[PDB]
Amino acid sequence: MSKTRVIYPGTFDPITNGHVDLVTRASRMFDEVVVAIAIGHHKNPLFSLEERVALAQSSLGHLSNVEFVGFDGLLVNFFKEQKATAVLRGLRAVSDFEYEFQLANMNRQLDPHFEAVFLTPSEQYSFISSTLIREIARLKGDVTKFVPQAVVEAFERKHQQGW
Numbered sequence: 270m271s272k273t274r275v276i277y278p279g280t281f282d283p284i285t286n287g288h289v290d291l292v293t294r295a296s297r298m299f300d301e302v303v304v305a306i307a308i309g310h311h312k313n314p315l316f317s318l319e320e321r322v323a324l325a326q327s328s329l330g331h332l333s334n335v336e337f338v339g340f341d342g343l344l345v346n347f348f349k350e351q352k353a354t355a356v357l358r359g360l361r362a363v364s365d366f367e368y369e370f371q372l373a374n375m376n377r378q379l380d381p382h383f384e385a386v387f388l389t390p391s392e393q394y395s396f397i398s399s400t401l402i403r404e405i406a407r408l409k410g411d412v413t414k415f416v417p418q419a420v421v422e423a424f425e426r427k428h429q430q431g432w
């Protein structure tokens with residue numbers, strides 16, 4: 270009769286309707302869900318950690334069993350620290366599927382307790398790629414269809430300065 274806690278890591282740069290769907294799904298089936306934002310020190314994300322967490326909070330705060338936290342280092346260690354039952358990943362048609370198996374199996378070798386549990390998002394979200402979203406925004410196009418309003422405004426606000 271133990272509580273479920275799943276960790277959903279990613280860069281969420283920025284969060285998309287697809288990510289929202291997934292979290293919504295996950296919130297319905299796990300007791301607690303942690304939206305885990307990888308800082309990306311060596312990665313160089315467009316949006317800052319604060320901006321990413323803010324935007325996630327805005328699109329998913331209404332779910333009461335959803336936490337939001339940034340993290341670096343090893344997902345396996347974050348997993349341990351958070352006393353997590355499993356790491357959640359999404360699985361679309363566009364997904365590097367062998368590349369989920371590498372992640373999953375290598376992490377298992379680092380920690381035999383590590384478990385991974387994929388969910389698939391509503392078919393309308395099977396084709397959107399944050400890379401393309403960011404590119405469309407950059408070229409002053411409409412991303413209203415692919416990300417929450419808050420994110421759309423973030424994009425303007427990013428144009429409006431330079432960082």
Ligand SMILES: CC(C)(COP(=O)(O)OP(=O)(O)OC[C@H]1O[C@@H](n2cnc3c(N)ncnc32)[C@H](O)[C@@H]1OP(=O)(O)O)[C@@H](O)C(=O)NCCC(=O)NCCS
Pocket residue numbers: 278279280281282285287288307342343344345359371372375376397398399400
């Ligand atoms: C954090 C981590 C899980 C993320 O990898 P990932 O599956 O690519 O997920 P990310 O958050 O990196 O997302 C990267 C890409 O996935 C894509 N993506 C995944 N789900 C998506 C969705 N629902 N909608 C749109 N794009 C999506 C995007 O194209 C994204 O591109 P971006 O780099 O512009 O954001 C992985 O890098 C990690 O675990 N790092 C921890 C460090 C570690 O342990 N390393 C060794 C593990 S063996």
